[PDB]
Subunit: 115 residues, 4 copies
């Protein structure tokens, strides 16, 4: 799989478990077309979202449902969700890890792009 999502919890110092993640691909008419989704595992990771054959060049949006995550922990959050929007490019390395570090009023995200 060319796309993995990893989510961490900066309040508890843990993986962020059972977080819903939705991936969209930008269509020709600039709408967001559902592409893949899942929930992070006990290690905070979401594997197997797509395949090399399906993951063609284009703009993708990864939506991480941070609000539901914080509410399930009894914590009041700021954001509706975290969004990561990027272009997949065949010129670069083949594997994309989208990582996010979550706090109630803040988040960080980085891309780790490797061969």
């Amino acid at each position: 799989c060319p796309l993995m999502v990893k989510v961490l919890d900066a309040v508890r110092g843990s993986p962020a478990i059972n977080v819903a993640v939705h991936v969209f691909r930008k269509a020709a008419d600039d709408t967001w077309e559902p592409f893949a989704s899942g929930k992070t595992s006990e290690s905070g990771e979401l594997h197997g979202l797509t395949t090399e054959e399906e993951f063609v060049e284009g703009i993708y949006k990864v939506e991480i449902d941070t609000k539901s995550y914080w509410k399930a922990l009894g914590i009041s959050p700021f954001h509706e969700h975290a969004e990561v929007v990027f272009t997949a490019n065949d010129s670069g390395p083949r594997r994309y890890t989208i990582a996010a570090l979550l706090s109630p009023y803040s988040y960080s995200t980085t891309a780790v792009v490797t061969n």
Copy 2:
């Protein structure tokens, strides 16, 4: 000034100047209506986006045009933009500062909410 945006550059250790910012508000029909836009000053700050009267309750999206920023500096970055999505003024008027710290393959964002 109930909505302010502040952007920093983590490569240069400086304000991120001339960063375009577009704000949207979710409409009754569930689309993103353009609400306000502007660009960061030499201090990396964007003031005057809206007014207390105009900044009513709603779900807002602050889109920070990070790709256009990096590309204007001769850099090819990872993200298209940073999107900050939040419910505002649910418990009455507040003042919101949306801060963002930018790197070519990573960003963080935090909200400072007062009064």
Copy 3:
């Protein structure tokens, strides 16, 4: 004011108030000599630590007492403190803002260096 420290709380979405900060400078004998100290205000800022005359070239350590901050709020955090270590004024006098964003098991820090 050539050295300023600003601290934010990522759990509350607020300035981090009453955070103790201790600054050290590496001595000729390679030990950390106490240089200045203070605490953040209601704005999360710490001004007046030093003067242009006193803030000479050197290697400085800014220790932000994050554990004491979280514990004063009834929270058991991970880190003892955040340490920011840097060479200052190597190319002549500059103004340094050390910013830190705090969560119980995570922090970030960035420097804004001007003139």
Copy 4:
């Protein structure tokens, strides 16, 4: 191994490879005693630093030589190094991952503590 260090590069969107890491344990006289060290791998990770038997409760410092890393890439950095100082506690989960995300004028660090 109860202690792992992971380092990421926010400029290149990659693991931070061949970064020197030094771990110290705080001695009874408040000095820092060398404990373990190594260099991050091609995946940006440093495994096998210590064992369960050696990693007793106490205060530890993880020093990440960020300055040499940026210089080897031809980039001018701000910090001398990144420091992560924490107490190992047997009450919590047994495995500590210290992660750091590096930019030239900024870094983030979080702890992922698991069983």
